[PDB]
Write a protein that holds these residues in place. Structure first.
Motif, short mmCIF file in Angstrom:
data_model
loop_
_atom_site.label_atom_id
_atom_site.label_comp_id
_atom_site.label_asym_id
_atom_site.label_seq_id
_atom_site.Cartn_x
_atom_site.Cartn_y
_atom_site.Cartn_z
N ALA A 147 0.82 -1.20 0.00
CA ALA A 147 0.00 0.00 0.00
C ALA A 147 0.86 1.26 0.00
O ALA A 147 1.55 1.55 0.98
CB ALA A 147 -0.95 0.00 1.20
N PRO A 148 0.82 2.01 -1.11
CA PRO A 148 1.53 3.29 -1.17
C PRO A 148 0.97 4.25 -0.13
O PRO A 148 -0.20 4.15 0.22
CB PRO A 148 1.23 3.80 -2.58
N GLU A 149 1.81 5.15 0.38
CA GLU A 149 1.35 6.09 1.39
C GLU A 149 0.23 6.96 0.87
O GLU A 149 0.35 7.58 -0.18
CB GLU A 149 2.51 6.95 1.89
N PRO A 150 -0.89 7.00 1.60
CA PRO A 150 -1.97 7.91 1.21
C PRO A 150 -1.51 9.35 1.32
O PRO A 150 -0.64 9.66 2.15
CB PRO A 150 -3.05 7.63 2.27
N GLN A 151 -2.08 10.22 0.50
CA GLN A 151 -1.70 11.63 0.46
C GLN A 151 -2.73 12.54 1.14
O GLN A 151 -3.93 12.44 0.89
CB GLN A 151 -1.47 12.08 -0.98
N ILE A 152 -2.24 13.42 2.01
CA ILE A 152 -3.10 14.38 2.70
C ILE A 152 -3.14 15.72 1.96
O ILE A 152 -2.10 16.29 1.62
CB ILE A 152 -2.66 14.58 4.15
N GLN A 153 -4.35 16.20 1.67
CA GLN A 153 -4.52 17.48 0.99
C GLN A 153 -5.20 18.47 1.92
O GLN A 153 -6.29 18.21 2.40
CB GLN A 153 -5.40 17.32 -0.26
N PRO A 154 -4.55 19.60 2.21
CA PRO A 154 -5.18 20.62 3.05
C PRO A 154 -6.34 21.31 2.34
O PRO A 154 -6.46 21.24 1.11
CB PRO A 154 -4.04 21.61 3.32
N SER A 155 -7.19 21.98 3.11
CA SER A 155 -8.30 22.72 2.55
C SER A 155 -8.05 24.21 2.69
O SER A 155 -7.26 24.62 3.54
CB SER A 155 -9.61 22.36 3.26
N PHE A 156 -8.71 25.00 1.86
CA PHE A 156 -8.60 26.45 1.92
C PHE A 156 -9.99 27.09 1.86
O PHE A 156 -10.33 27.75 0.88
CB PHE A 156 -7.74 26.97 0.76
N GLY B 279 -19.81 20.90 9.25
CA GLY B 279 -19.86 20.25 7.95
C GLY B 279 -18.79 20.72 6.98
O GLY B 279 -18.71 20.22 5.86
N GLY B 280 -17.96 21.67 7.41
CA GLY B 280 -16.90 22.20 6.56
C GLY B 280 -15.70 21.29 6.36
O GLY B 280 -15.28 20.59 7.28
N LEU B 281 -15.13 21.28 5.15
CA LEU B 281 -13.95 20.47 4.85
C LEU B 281 -12.70 20.96 5.59
O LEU B 281 -12.31 22.14 5.47
CB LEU B 281 -13.70 20.50 3.34
N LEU B 282 -12.08 20.05 6.33
CA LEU B 282 -10.85 20.33 7.08
C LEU B 282 -9.59 19.83 6.37
O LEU B 282 -8.56 20.52 6.35
CB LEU B 282 -10.95 19.68 8.48
N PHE B 283 -9.65 18.63 5.80
CA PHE B 283 -8.57 18.06 5.00
C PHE B 283 -9.13 16.86 4.25
O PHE B 283 -10.24 16.41 4.56
CB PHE B 283 -7.34 17.68 5.87
N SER B 284 -8.38 16.36 3.27
CA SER B 284 -8.77 15.18 2.52
C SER B 284 -7.65 14.16 2.51
O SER B 284 -6.47 14.51 2.67
CB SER B 284 -9.16 15.52 1.08
N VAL B 285 -8.01 12.91 2.29
CA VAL B 285 -7.03 11.83 2.16
C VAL B 285 -7.30 11.11 0.85
O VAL B 285 -8.41 10.62 0.63
CB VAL B 285 -7.16 10.81 3.31
N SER B 286 -6.30 11.06 -0.03
CA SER B 286 -6.48 10.39 -1.32
C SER B 286 -5.50 9.24 -1.45
O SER B 286 -4.36 9.32 -0.99
CB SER B 286 -6.28 11.37 -2.48
N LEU B 287 -5.96 8.15 -2.05
CA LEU B 287 -5.10 6.98 -2.21
C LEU B 287 -5.50 6.12 -3.41
O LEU B 287 -6.62 6.22 -3.91
CB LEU B 287 -5.08 6.16 -0.92
N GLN C 175 -8.32 1.95 -8.61
CA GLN C 175 -9.03 3.23 -8.68
C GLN C 175 -8.45 4.21 -7.66
O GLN C 175 -7.83 3.81 -6.68
CB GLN C 175 -10.53 3.05 -8.49
N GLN C 176 -8.62 5.49 -7.93
CA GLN C 176 -8.24 6.51 -6.96
C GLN C 176 -9.48 6.87 -6.17
O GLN C 176 -10.56 7.04 -6.74
CB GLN C 176 -7.65 7.74 -7.66
N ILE C 177 -9.35 6.97 -4.85
CA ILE C 177 -10.48 7.31 -4.01
C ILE C 177 -10.08 8.40 -3.04
O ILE C 177 -8.91 8.49 -2.66
CB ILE C 177 -11.01 6.10 -3.23
N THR C 178 -11.05 9.22 -2.64
CA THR C 178 -10.78 10.33 -1.75
C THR C 178 -11.76 10.31 -0.58
O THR C 178 -12.95 10.04 -0.76
CB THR C 178 -10.90 11.67 -2.48
N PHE C 179 -11.22 10.56 0.61
CA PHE C 179 -12.00 10.67 1.82
C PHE C 179 -11.85 12.08 2.36
O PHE C 179 -10.81 12.72 2.15
CB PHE C 179 -11.52 9.63 2.85
#
Length: 125
Positions: free
Chosen positions: A3-12, A17-25, A83-87
């Protein structure tokens, strides 16, 4: 299984209910389900981001899949290998000073479940 390291994406973020960060893998071979879940309250899927520079500032959150369903340990999203998925980490705090916030979450891959910890260090502003 690898399993490759999942990537963390910050929000702006301070809205419920507001987006704080995302995790994509990328879904590994032989995997049919993936969850990304917090462990502050593991049974209810709640996390707690804490300001690294101020103990007294926290943000409670949940992690959802792309259909907005809360992720839990051993209960995630059905997926296809490659597939690429995002949380998405969404603010669950009712009632945020800018800074760097930390928490640790878990990624589970259904191969039996294989688990991998994931450190989160993100700017929230």
């Amino acid at each position: 299984f690898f399993a490759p390291e999942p990537q963390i994406q910050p929000s702006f973020v301070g809205k419920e209910g507001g987006l704080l960060f995302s995790v994509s893998l990328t879904v590994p071979e032989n995997v049919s389900q993936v969850t990304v879940y917090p462990v502050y309250d593991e049974d209810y899927g709640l996390g707690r981001l804490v300001n690294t520079a101020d103990d007294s500032q926290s943000i409670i959150y949940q992690i959802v899949d792309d259909k907005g369903r809360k992720m839990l340990k051993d209960h995630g999203a059905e997926v296809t290998p490659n597939q690429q998925i995002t949380f998405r980490a969404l603010n669950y705090t009712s009632g945020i000073p800018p800074g760097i916030y930390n928490d640790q979450v878990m990624v589970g891959y259904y191969v039996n479940w294989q688990y991998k910890s994931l450190d989160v260090n993100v700017n929230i502003e």
